[model samples]
Target chain A: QLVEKLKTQMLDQEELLASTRRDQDNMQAELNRLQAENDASKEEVKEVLQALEELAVNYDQKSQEVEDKTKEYELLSDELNQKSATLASIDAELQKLKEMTNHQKKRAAEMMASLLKDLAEIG
Target chain B: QLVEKLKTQMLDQEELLASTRRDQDNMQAELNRLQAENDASKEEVKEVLQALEELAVNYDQKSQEVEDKTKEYELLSDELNQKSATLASIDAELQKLKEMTNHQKKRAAEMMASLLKDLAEIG
Candidate 1:
C-alpha cells in the first residue's frame, strides 16, 4: 500500500507538471502573437510618419506658391489701375488738342478771306 | 531509503513547477506591455491620419485659389495691353493735330503780312 500511494502521488505530480507546461506553451504562443502584432503596428506607424512628413513638405511648398501668386495678382491689378488712369489723362488731353486745332483752322480761314477782300479793294 | 528518494523526487517536481510558473508570470507581464504599446501606436497613427487628411484638404483649397488668381492676373494683363495700344493710337492722333495747328498759325501770319504791305502802299 505504501508503494501504491507513492506511485499515485508521483503520477499526480507528473500530471501537474504537464499541465503547467501546457499553460506555459499557451502563454508562449500568445506572447509570440502579441510580439508580432506589436512589430507590425510599429512598422505601419513608421511608414505613415514618413508619408505624413512628405505630404507636409508638399503642402508647405504649395502654400508658398499660392502666396507668391497672390502677390503677383495684386501687382498686376495695381498696374492695370495705373494704366487706366493714364489712359483717362491722355483722353482728356486729346479732346483739348482737337478743340485747339479746330479753332486755329477757323481763324486762319477768316484771315485769308479778309486779306483777299483788302487786295480786291486795292486793285 | 526508497521513501526518502520519493520525497526528493517530489521536491524536484515542485521546483520545476515553480520555475515554469515564474516563466509564465514573466511572459504575461511582457504580453501586457506589448499590448499597451500596440494600443498607443494605433492611437498615434489614427491622430496622424486625421492631420494628414486635414492638411490635404487645405492644400487642395489653396491650389484652387492660386489657379483662380492666376486667371485673374492674365485677364488684367490683357486689358492693360489693350489700353496701352489705345493710348498709343491717341498719342499719334494728338501729334498730328499739333502739327496741323502750328501750320495753320504760320499761314495766318504770312497772309496778314502780305495784306498789311498792300495797305501801306495804297496809303
Candidate 2:
C-alpha cells in the first residue's frame, strides 16, 4: 500500500510538472508577442519622427517664402506711392505752364493792337 | 525495497515539479515586464501621433499663408507696373505740351515782326 501511494503521488507530481511547463511556454509566447509589438511601435515612432523632420523643413521654407513676398510687396507699394506723387506733381506743373503761356499770348495780342492803332493815327 | 525505490522516484518528481513552477513564475515576471514596456511604447506612439497632427495643421496654415502672400505680391507687382506706365505716359504728354507751347510762341513772334514792318512802311 505504501508503494502504491508513492506511485500515485509521483503521478500527480508529474501532472503538475507538465501543467507548469505548459504555463511557462504560454508565458514565453506572450512575452515574444509583446516584444514584437513593442518593436513595431518603436518603428512607427521612428518613421513618424522622420516625417516630422521633413515637414518641419518644408514649413520653414514656406515661412521664408511668405516673409520674402511680404517684403517685396511692401517695396512695390512704396514705389507705387512715390510714382503716384510724381505724377501729381507733373500734372500741377503742366497746369501752371499752360496758364503762364495763355497769359503771355494775351499780352502779345494787346501789344499788336496798340501798334495797329499807332499806325492808323500816322496814316 | 520497491517502496523505497518508489519514495525516491516521488522525491525526484517533486523536485522536477518545483523547478518547473519556478520557471513558470519567472516567465510570468518577464511577461509582466514586457507588457509594461509594450504599454509604454503605445503611449509614446499616441503622443507622437498627436504631435504630428498639430504640426500638420501648423504646416498647412503656413503653406496657405505663403500662397496668399505670393498672390498678393503678384497683384501688387502688376499694379505697380501699370502705374509706372501711367507715369511714363504723363511725362511724355508734358514734354509734348511744352514743345507745342514753344512752337506757338515762335509763330506769334514772327507775326509781330511782320506787323511792325508793315507799320514802318506806312509811316
Candidate 3:
C-alpha cells in the first residue's frame, strides 16, 4: 500500500509540473500579444494627433482670412450703393438739362415766327 | 526513510502550488493593466477622429468662402481694368462728338446771321 501511494503522488507531481509550465507559456503569449497591441495603439494615436495638428493650423489661418473677406464684401457693397446714388444723381441732372435745351429751342422758333407775322401785318 | 520520502513529496507539492499561484496572480494583474491601457488609447483615438471630422467639415466650408472671396477680388480687379479701358475709349469718343457739335454749332450760327441779313435786305 505504501509503494502504490508513493507512485500515485509521484504521478500527480509530474502532471502538476507540466500543467503549470503550460499555463506559464499560455500566459506569456497572452501578455505578449496584449503588450504588442498596446504599443501599436500608441503609435496610431501619435499619427492621428500629428495629422490633426496639421489640419488645425490650416483651419485657423483660413478662419481669419474668411473673416477679412466677409468684411471686404461688406465694404464693397457699401461702395456699390454709393456708386448707384451717383448714377441716379447724374440721371436727374441730365433730365433737367435736356428740358432746358428744348425750352430754349422753342423760344428761338417762336421769335422767328413772330417776326414773320410782323412782316405780314405791314402788308 | 520511507516516512521521510512522504514528507518530501508533500513539501514539493505545497511549494509548487504556492509559487504558481503567486506567478499567475502577478501575470493576470499585469494583463489587466495592459488591457486598460489599450482601452484608454482606443477612447482617445475615437476623440481624435471626432475632432478631426468636425474640423474637416468646418474647414471645407471656409475654404469655399475663401475661394469665392478670392474670385470676387479678381472680378473687381477686372472690373476696374475694364473701367479704365472704357474711360480711355469714351474720352476719344467724346472728343470726336464735341468736334462734330462745334461744326454744327458753327453752321447754325452762320445760318442765323444769313437769315437775319436776308430778311432785312428784302425790306
Best by TM-score: 3
Sorting all predicted structures by TM-score, with the top scorer first, yields 3, 1, 2
Q: Tell me the TM-score for chain B of model 3.
A: 0.64
Tens-digit lDDT track of model 2 for A43-115: 6645554555566578887656655655654565565556556555655655565566556556755765687
- lDDT string for model 3 (B3-119, tens) is 788667656755755564565456556555655655565466556545555665787887666556556545655555555565556556555655665565467557656977997
Model 2 quality (TM-score): 0.39
* DockQ of candidate 1 against the true complex: 0.01
lDDT of 1 by residue, A15-113 (tens): 755565565456556555655665555566555545555665676787666566556545655655565565556556555655665565567557656
- Please give me the total number of clashing residue pairs in predicted model 2: 0
Candidates' C-alpha lDDT: 0.60, 0.60, 0.60
Q: What tens digits encode model 2's per-residue C-alpha lDDT throughout B1-123?
A: 687885686577557555645655565565556556655655665555455556656768876765665565455556555655655565565556556655655675576568768979998
Better of 1 and 3 by TM-score: 3
- Ten-residue stretch with the least lDDT total in model 2 chain B: B72-81
Backbone clashes per model, in order? Answer: 0, 0, 0
Structural similarity to truth (TM-score) of each candidate: 0.43, 0.39, 0.45
> What would the C-alpha RMSD of candidate 1 be, to one decimal place?
71.0
> Chain B TM-score for each model?
0.75, 0.66, 0.64
